[model samples]
Target: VETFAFQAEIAQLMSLIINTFYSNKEIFLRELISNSSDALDKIRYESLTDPSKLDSGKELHINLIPNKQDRTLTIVDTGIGMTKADLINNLGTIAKSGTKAFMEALQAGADISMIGQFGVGFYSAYLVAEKVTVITKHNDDEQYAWESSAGGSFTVRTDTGEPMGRGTKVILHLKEDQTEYLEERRIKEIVKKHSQFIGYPITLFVE
Candidate 1:
């Protein structure tokens, strides 16, 4: 297991996102769904050139599992998962290396209506979660878990749990005041509102 500090710019970006960007916290769900869809698309595209990438036979879909007992909501996707380096670079960097302009625009009240546009949508998890855990398995790399609390640093470790086969799982440990995300009805409503047109099937685990 290895721990890494969030890039200086990324830490600042996370703080800005949690403190200023979103007024509707429910959009965190939307952002996450969009990301999952993108990953699914990536794998699909890559498989066109190399069919073996899809050998795992994991269906292309997304799953939402909310556990009220644990105050956590997990979103799983069978998509192109991230390798350790991808995790460090993707999750640890901001806006693909143009931090100065992005930060300036954010502070200037730029309308960030689209979360994915900035590539920082993942940070929105902190809107409702005190901690975020991501377990991902890429076709080219071993499964691994990345965790953070939107703090100064985050950690990446080998995933010792059952083999995830392929894709990613994001588990959000909800804040005390944000337990509503753990409700089946609420999650359904959010998915319907924001991701109804997503190409992949989205299944919500009930009971």
Candidate 2:
């Protein structure tokens, strides 16, 4: 398939689905955290191959900071970041998504539940955020940041002044409707419930 196309019909259907089909929007942050967990996995295994490229001492974990006063929540992870190619492939286009391979895996005894067809890492931020800022540093490239909101165009540029780390920090400007998840008790419960079974530890910090 030289160019697998999204049918005009499918495009219209998807737009309608995104705009009107599903209205429960609290799911946005959940998706972003899931992507961070996946990134941790990618980095953990890659570190075995290039130990110098990763923070070898820190076991992978998730951290969130919620400011009720200012109402900004930050989620961070030291994980595998995107190359320019990864960004173009992950955020710019949706064709060669994990779909093709996931379908193949499902048929070959992979648990269907384990195969999420839509790995919408960047797109998921819109669920709870009016603004989502992503700061990332890759092993071989210059540190950078990406920002987006309101389903408007996203911009990727150099990290102007943010501290450099080998992972990612996602700052979410929370909407009023989804403020409950920003609370420490509620957030910890959700994390422990959903992610306790996960291989890594989940930490909670509140001020």
Candidate 3:
């Protein structure tokens, strides 16, 4: 997984979802929301002693800024981010426990619904992103940032943003062809769909 090779089916799945689901582009936000929820859950559990687990030292939640002018979306959450190893393995590779049959269906042209249920459901940001920057800070580890194009290869470096205190911020640089996801109403809708039951608050930026 060092070089980022897609499972035999990932290539076809990426092409199919991005091309066929123009209206369904909002789901990528949902995917991110789901990922954010998972991150929050991780830190919430770790906060028995890590009392600074709240945003800037308050509570926990998620938010998104849809920059229509820039054709970008920023999904932020007060959650546990990946360590160096977590990012490389979680975001860098496609090892979803055990899903051989599912992989076969994807290779056989399964719809986006099924393909997305496996692997890292969150990584689909690449479906609409030209480039994505992830800023993650662990309460116990140094803050770091990672950058990647929808294609292969990625770079990681240190960051200087205000400390999330206990979460991650993902900035998605949307491609010209996928600007439709910046709609506020739609973002909220997606959040509700995938994250309503999530243990934290979810918001779409208004100001």
Candidate 4:
């Protein structure tokens, strides 16, 4: 088990994102599915250049499972997963100097995808989830779980569950006020509105 703490700057960024998007928590689904699509694109590109890099018959798709009984919602995808180093690099963002300076630099850019602008979309799960668990497996790395509750830190460790081959799964433990997320119609409507054109299948049930 590897314990880690988010930097002051990253924490600040998360707070900003959460506060800015608090009114529209459904956007979290859009952001996460977009990320999954981007990952699928990455793996497909890798296959075109180096076929051996991808396994045979590894189709790209996304699965949405809402377990009302468990008070959890899960989204999984057969897309490019992250290596341990990749996870550390992508998730371990820190400020260069000070908060004011970082905020100034952030304001100078219009792109949320900008390096310092931060990948705050992932943290949007905190808007409606008490906790988020990620299980992913990359072709070059062993499977692992990344867990956090947005309490300024996260943890990573080798996953003991069955391998996912090559993909990522995110489980959201729904908060009490987030029961709307468990409704199938609500999820379907959100998908139709925000992700209807995704390149891959977006089933409402786990496959």
Q: For each candidate, C-alpha RMSD in Å? A: 1.9, 6.4, 3.7, 3.8
List the candidate 1 regions with Cα displacement exceeding 4 Å: 90-102, 111-113
**Candidate 2: tens digits of C-alpha lDDT, residues 1-207:** 012234333233233323543354545555667878888898898888888766533557667778888778888787876665554344445633554454455458654234335453344455566677778777766667776554324566777676556677888887677788678888877666555565555566686
Clashes of 4: 0
For every model shown, what is its TM-score relative to the native structure?
A: 0.92, 0.73, 0.79, 0.84
Q: Report lDDT per candidate.
A: 0.85, 0.62, 0.68, 0.77
1-207: candidate 3 lDDT, tens digit per residue: 123444434444444445564445556776777778887777777777766565444567887888987778998887777776666565534444424545467669864555446754555676778788888887556778887664435667667767667678999999887766787776667766766787787777874
> For model 3, what is the error of residue 173's alpha carbon versus the real structure, in angstroms, after optimal superposition?
0.8
Q: Candidate 3: list runs displaced more than 4 Å.
A: 1-23, 49-58, 90-102
Q: Which digits, one per residue and each the tens of the lDDT, describe model 4 over residues 68-185?
A: 8899999899888888876666546433233445456568864333322344456667777888899999888999999887768878999999879899899999989898988888
lDDT leaderboard ranking: 1, 4, 3, 2
State which candidate has the highest lDDT: 1
Candidate 2 ranges with C-alpha deviation above 4 Å: 1-18, 21-24, 55-58, 88-91, 95-116
Mark the 10 consecutive residues where model 4 has the least summed lDDT.
Answer: 110-119
Identify the superior model by TM-score, candidate 3 or candidate 4.
4
Worst 10 residues of 1 by lDDT: 91-100
Clashing pairs in 2: none
